[PDB]
């Protein structure tokens, strides 16, 4: 039977994977090889000019990595997947495959910082200009389009304060103007959002976060039409970034994603409990979490995502000093820059990852002095709340 | 004591590595993590604005990968190393870090095909033009330089027929014109050639070949000045290609390189025996191997490399059909596109990896119909010669 | 704070693990080493006569494997843990550590077949005799005890038909007679049952099943008093079986167990749905599942386990031929001998794993001709039920 | 063609390995699985009663581990191989498979300490008695034989001072009395000694040392007749020790052994240079190294081994205090208990690993106060000699 016919949890577990044909090994073998041998010169000829359209494997189409690419293609309802060395490489491989000197991109502003740096500094040095807009306002996207515009690029929910972007509406705008829509689905993952089903042409993830979920792989994935993915593979990866994923990283991500459904359900149930606790706490001025009724785009999130995700941002009373105290007083949450792990991770951007960026530039970038971002893990939510309550109380008494 | 003071085999084994400080583990631990935790907000602040200048680790400076980068910096006598997802990513990360729209590159013609494709097709689409020259003639390099020329790029020995490039001379030319020299040292490796010691500014490898040597890692490494490597890391990798090496791939390459000295000695001793056998064989029209006295640049190879390498190319009598017969009649050598493995690998480019490319374009590219490339492995050389003798005899009777 | 104070899900995620002290790496490093180096002869002297009572690491106390042993000690509420090469090695290392020529063991009959073979054939050849009893009847255990009896050994739920053993009662019997109680907790795992909290002295698992849960590790773990575990480590493992777990297998099991809580909840919710479907199906004569009200020991299971587990056994109408037809007609469930994986696995013991064992001996051993055992995975339960309904219908029409 | 026909280096590289049939992957895939699936109930029936005599794989006959077992069977010229969790498990699995209550073993005295402990303490508690003899005197072996004697067990070279055992002679003695000869070949490895070719029935190794050679695997291997290995697998491993090797450890050992020939050649060339230096040094009273003409059994070593190995033992002037000073003054050699690594490792047994064992018992056991054991690695031998010269000079001035 066909992977695409099963329910979503069944696809999470099975899609792209079968017992090994030669051995019956249930786990996908780790094909940790750099080379593939041919049985004759004919085979060498055919299936190295053919470009992987029988079943012939190559280091750009490793059997292990193939399984992961097919899985994620199924979960996202795209035709084909392409794994990469990092979430950044998924984004740059995509964009550098699509764009040449003289092209233009319209991008959301409220995006992952390293993406913002690639788009603001790197792209224009290759002759590709980018306009940044507030993608929460689809009209700003339309107004930025140019005859040169090849692609519109968005993240949702948006990186710091988890404001949302209306994918369906933006896809319509981009397509009417003949651009592709590229959506970074990292923070939702397949489970919570499916951009392609909403009109996006290409979805990218950092698997580093939820898809792997175990805090032990850096990796990225791109999903879209075969025609695009073929180019992203045989030109973008092969020729431009060289950002191939190692078969071991693919194997671990395959293993991590087996639990995607139940981890996302746990992260989301936990985050909701925690968000409600924070919403009720007199030392917290604001809580940003799509799952709360006070979310300005609550209606959109309802239409567009199946769960409200495991990330919460919130502002502590007392600004910068309160933020540093709270962060230094947590005992269970771990201070880190990543997200989407099994452990609960916390960060204070204005206290840590943005100390150089003067008061003007960080607040502008959505980062207030009292802003804390919380990646909710799989611990007992009452342990996480107790830890937060203890740290907040210390920071604000 | 200092790694840089030991003999070369001692450096191969020890450089960049120490027993783990907390445990005494002799093997470098595999730090297969995506995230690093901070002990406080201060630490988060300092050592994430500081940019890894105490000992703080980050996913761009993973402890495992650090060890490999330091090892290869020592072996190449460079200041700093930077690992990458692939040999192609080492080359593109380097060049895209150095070059912007309006820049120019002078490159050798006789280089790895995927490098040639990145340079001929990808670079000009980002506004960076490339002139290809015969680098065996340092005068062609000088004549191609322009006011826009940022870097001269060479491979040696050159890819198909193992003609050589005079690094010292080319470095002088490039520097007099204010360009950097980038040398791809893949085929020699640290052990056989040290471009930086000859005036190159940056060396790149595919570790996929000899440095790893085990046919089970795709990876790349870049070595050069700290100032350059810092940019290649914190801008090229972080912002442009995202071509990070996974800590497991770094660990395996660390383990592979432990035997670099004795594998290179074995490959080179074996290849010399095999090259001499082929040179004496009436069905072989030509043998290309720097270790033979009939090599046109024999004197240069003597000055520039400590051993003549493990790759041999040779032409079989009877052109295309003889090539396909020989290749189909080998029983021990394996048909494959890679090189630098423990096993002996053979390929017929005109029979396999170049079937589309009409008779005009392949011969031009140094590939004759009867050209066979042999990566000599660690088997008994008489077994390899017996296998070759048997296949040649079949192909040419 | 102390791992032992957190809620159980928090312990699953955190117990035995901390960010790496030297690097802040969040994932436990894989210490894939065979050797540990000393800083001086004094250190060599002390901490190799001391026997690992500071923090000194050794190949029997690998840092990675230590983390897994401590985790499982916490989850089981034992003092100390000891990992091993396999679930069988956890059982034999334990028993061979405790027992010498002239000793006796009382064992449950309804246990894992390879355990039964070690106990029935191997133990008596070393002078250690074993009496097998129906442990569902604690009186049979008491009646088998002898002055030589060192240990009572039970599995629960019992292997084929998931009948239960009253741990608390049996522990009391064993201790009154001065024997230790060893419980194999494989099928429940920490999450569903905690034998030590019920009076067992030692718990063993095959981590191959639920604790790892990903179908890609063979491994075992033993938990008990430090005094016992010290002997099981420094004598049983070091001297007798040599059944050390590799640090990589420990790392993967650590990673697998992070999701134990949410996998057990999913397996158990799924199995209950499936068990209810099977209980309502006219082609299924019997369903064995502790979670059904018709379980003869329903009351005991209520007292003794927090969830009713993910394994179901059931009998199909039409005996042997119906069993083979059903098994050959499933399309999503996979035919396999293991259990406790993310995928749903099915087996027909009388059709497969017991074809030699004549009709007399298998039925006696609780295996009827129509008995099917189902390991329920993480797929959508309606997909599993649809698959079963389809196969049953084919097998019984 | 047949693996068994090639030269030895060719066998090292190729034996037991082929490109993956389904993919052409050159590296043996890591089959890191616990479970194997069947295609039907028939297959389940046949090839789980059949016991792995078609090509059916099982966790006791993992495809990866199979490759390693076949390789080592070829290198040792035995019929079949069996991998295990540790070198100790190779020895105990073997002996516990062969021996039952009332049996007897004649064993060499000068053997690995943990082997000595298993034989002296563990075996007699299972009703199996052991007589220890000086195996350098084959007459002591004959004189210890009894009607109960099932197996003679030897190591050579012998553990501390590298005295030799005449395998051919001892095999003849054992067989005339109807016992099996088991030889621990760890210190020589396939490359330097082949006991089966000399009349031994079974060879065991710790692969932890030379066969793996990289200081990152603990593992063992047993080679002998199919009939024996079948029992050691399906009874010893499956039923008794459970000491299965993980497929990843097998994969790494496969990768390590690819370089066995060239590592052994390097270790042996280095050790000879170092041994000659030590033999000429006035602060070293004695040097034990089979490669020196002053070795009492020099003639035997000539007949019995192809190279004299990479281990050296030697006595420093000034006894215990000189030993501790020397060891504390080395800067390149690493203090460790293992051997057979790429790095040079040094130990002072009387200073470290034998501090409890009073002056009477250690000297008796061949360990003098001034005895140092050196595992010579792959560094430049002049760096190792310089390091030794520096440490000796400090220790003895």
From TrEMBL, chains A, B, C, D:
Residues modified as Cysteine sulfenic acid (-SOH): 3, 114, 192, 244
UniProt-listed Enzyme Commission number(s): 4.4.1.11
GO terms for cellular component: cytoplasm
Requisite cofactors: pyridoxal 5'-phosphate
Catalytic reaction equation(s): L-homocysteine + H2O = 2-oxobutanoate + hydrogen sulfide + NH4(+) + H(+); L-methionine + H2O = methanethiol + 2-oxobutanoate + NH4(+)
SUPFAM superfamilies documented for this protein: PLP-dependent transferases (SSF53383)
GO biological process: transsulfuration
Keyword match Lipid metabolism: no
Keywords: Lyase, Pyridoxal phosphate
Coiled coil: none
The UniProt record lists the keyword Lyase: yes
One Pfam family it belongs to: Cys_Met_Meta_PP
Signal peptide boundaries: none
GO molecular function: homocysteine desulfhydrase activity; methionine gamma-lyase activity; pyridoxal phosphate binding
Modified residues (N6-(pyridoxal phosphate)lysine): 209
Protein family membership: Belongs to the trans-sulfuration enzymes family. L-methionine gamma-lyase subfamily.
Subunit organization: Homotetramer; dimer of active dimers.
Stated name of the protein: L-methionine gamma-lyase
